[PDB]
Design a protein around this motif. Structure first.
Motif, mmCIF file in Angstrom:
data_model
loop_
_atom_site.group_PDB
_atom_site.id
_atom_site.type_symbol
_atom_site.label_atom_id
_atom_site.label_comp_id
_atom_site.label_asym_id
_atom_site.label_seq_id
_atom_site.Cartn_x
_atom_site.Cartn_y
_atom_site.Cartn_z
ATOM 1 N N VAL A 1 118.939 4.977 -30.316
ATOM 2 C CA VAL A 1 119.490 5.032 -28.965
ATOM 3 C C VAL A 1 120.246 3.748 -28.646
ATOM 4 N N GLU A 2 119.645 2.595 -28.954
ATOM 5 C CA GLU A 2 120.389 1.354 -28.709
ATOM 6 C C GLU A 2 121.668 1.311 -29.537
ATOM 7 N N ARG A 3 121.607 1.770 -30.786
ATOM 8 C CA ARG A 3 122.784 1.744 -31.642
ATOM 9 C C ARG A 3 123.893 2.617 -31.077
ATOM 10 N N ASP A 4 123.547 3.812 -30.601
ATOM 11 C CA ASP A 4 124.555 4.702 -30.034
ATOM 12 C C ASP A 4 125.146 4.124 -28.753
ATOM 13 N N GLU A 5 124.312 3.505 -27.915
ATOM 14 C CA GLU A 5 124.825 2.887 -26.696
ATOM 15 C C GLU A 5 125.812 1.772 -27.032
ATOM 16 N N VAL A 6 125.448 0.926 -27.996
ATOM 17 C CA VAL A 6 126.339 -0.151 -28.408
ATOM 18 C C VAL A 6 127.619 0.419 -29.001
ATOM 19 N N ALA A 7 127.508 1.516 -29.755
ATOM 20 C CA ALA A 7 128.691 2.131 -30.346
ATOM 21 C C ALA A 7 129.627 2.673 -29.275
ATOM 22 N N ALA A 8 129.070 3.269 -28.221
ATOM 23 C CA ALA A 8 129.904 3.754 -27.125
ATOM 24 C C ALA A 8 130.639 2.599 -26.456
ATOM 25 N N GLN A 9 129.916 1.509 -26.181
ATOM 26 C CA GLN A 9 130.571 0.326 -25.625
ATOM 27 C C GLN A 9 131.674 -0.162 -26.552
ATOM 28 N N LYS A 10 131.384 -0.208 -27.850
ATOM 29 C CA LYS A 10 132.368 -0.644 -28.828
ATOM 30 C C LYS A 10 133.615 0.221 -28.777
ATOM 31 N N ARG A 11 133.436 1.540 -28.814
ATOM 32 C CA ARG A 11 134.571 2.452 -28.834
ATOM 33 C C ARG A 11 135.424 2.270 -27.592
ATOM 34 N N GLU A 12 134.778 2.098 -26.438
ATOM 35 C CA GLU A 12 135.536 1.811 -25.228
ATOM 36 C C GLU A 12 136.349 0.535 -25.397
ATOM 37 N N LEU A 13 135.746 -0.492 -26.003
ATOM 38 C CA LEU A 13 136.465 -1.749 -26.186
ATOM 39 C C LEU A 13 137.692 -1.576 -27.076
ATOM 40 N N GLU A 14 137.551 -0.896 -28.220
ATOM 41 C CA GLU A 14 138.741 -0.733 -29.064
ATOM 42 C C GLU A 14 139.785 0.150 -28.392
ATOM 43 N N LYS A 15 139.372 1.168 -27.635
ATOM 44 C CA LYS A 15 140.371 1.976 -26.944
ATOM 45 C C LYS A 15 141.145 1.127 -25.942
ATOM 46 N N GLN A 16 140.437 0.290 -25.181
ATOM 47 C CA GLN A 16 141.109 -0.600 -24.240
ATOM 48 C C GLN A 16 142.052 -1.550 -24.964
ATOM 49 N N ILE A 17 141.607 -2.106 -26.092
ATOM 50 C CA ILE A 17 142.442 -3.038 -26.844
ATOM 51 C C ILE A 17 143.712 -2.342 -27.318
ATOM 52 N N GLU A 18 143.565 -1.127 -27.848
ATOM 53 C CA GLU A 18 144.720 -0.386 -28.342
ATOM 54 C C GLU A 18 145.688 -0.061 -27.215
ATOM 55 N N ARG A 19 145.166 0.267 -26.031
ATOM 56 C CA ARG A 19 146.041 0.675 -24.939
ATOM 57 C C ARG A 19 147.060 -0.400 -24.584
ATOM 58 N N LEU A 20 146.794 -1.654 -24.945
ATOM 59 C CA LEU A 20 147.685 -2.767 -24.657
ATOM 60 C C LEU A 20 148.547 -3.152 -25.853
ATOM 61 N N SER A 21 148.583 -2.320 -26.894
ATOM 62 C CA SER A 21 149.121 -2.755 -28.179
ATOM 63 C C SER A 21 150.644 -2.663 -28.234
ATOM 64 N N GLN A 22 151.190 -1.458 -28.138
ATOM 65 C CA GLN A 22 152.588 -1.213 -28.455
ATOM 66 C C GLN A 22 153.189 -0.239 -27.454
ATOM 67 N N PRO A 23 154.527 -0.236 -27.306
ATOM 68 C CA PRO A 23 155.434 -1.241 -27.874
ATOM 69 C C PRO A 23 155.280 -2.528 -27.085
ATOM 70 N N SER A 24 155.133 -2.342 -25.778
ATOM 71 C CA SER A 24 154.557 -3.330 -24.882
ATOM 72 C C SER A 24 153.408 -2.638 -24.171
ATOM 73 N N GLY A 25 152.217 -3.225 -24.256
ATOM 74 C CA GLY A 25 151.009 -2.567 -23.791
ATOM 75 C C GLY A 25 151.191 -1.834 -22.479
ATOM 76 N N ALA A 26 151.092 -0.513 -22.538
ATOM 77 C CA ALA A 26 151.340 0.370 -21.402
ATOM 78 C C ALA A 26 150.765 1.738 -21.760
ATOM 79 N N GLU A 27 151.120 2.755 -20.975
ATOM 80 C CA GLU A 27 150.693 4.129 -21.243
ATOM 81 C C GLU A 27 151.517 4.717 -22.392
ATOM 82 N N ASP A 28 151.456 4.031 -23.535
ATOM 83 C CA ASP A 28 152.313 4.340 -24.673
ATOM 84 C C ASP A 28 152.012 5.687 -25.314
ATOM 85 N N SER A 29 150.982 6.408 -24.864
ATOM 86 C CA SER A 29 150.669 7.699 -25.471
ATOM 87 C C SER A 29 151.879 8.623 -25.438
ATOM 88 N N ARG A 30 152.469 8.806 -24.257
ATOM 89 C CA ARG A 30 153.728 9.520 -24.118
ATOM 90 C C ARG A 30 154.852 8.650 -23.585
#
Lengths: 49, 50
Positions: free
Chosen positions: A1-30
């Motif tokens: 349970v602790e591992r899954d909770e930490v993993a969820a926090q982690k995944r949120e962190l990488e998603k946030q990091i990616e959202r600022l990546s390219q081309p200039s961090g914005a709603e680059d999905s579309r």
């Protein structure tokens, strides 16, 4: 349970990091296709500096 | 990083093409012998575009 909770926090962190990546961090999905498909430039990039 | 490199290459190519096209306008209608115009043709090589 602790591992899954930490993993969820982690995944949120990488998603946030990616959202600022390219081309200039914005709603680059579309925002990308929405930007090059038309002869325009991202406002955030315009105010990048 | 690779995607960013590709995008910056594309942007620089577009900017240089625009600048060369702008410069080209001044050489329109130059009468030299049978020569009537001069252009700097800029293109992206397929071997590098792919």
């Amino acid at each position: 349970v602790e591992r899954d909770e930490v993993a969820a926090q982690k995944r949120e962190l990488e998603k946030q990091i990616e959202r600022l990546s390219q081309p200039s961090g914005a709603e680059d999905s579309r925002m990308i296709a929405l930007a090059e498909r038309f002869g325009g430039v991202l406002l955030s990039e315009i105010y990048d500096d | 990083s690779s995607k960013s490199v590709a995008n910056i290459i594309r942007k620089t190519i577009q900017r240089e093409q625009n600048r060369i096209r702008m410069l080209n306008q001044g050489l329109q209608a130059v009468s030299f012998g049978q020569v009537r115009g001069v252009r700097l043709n800029v293109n992206v090589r397929e071997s590098h575009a792919i």
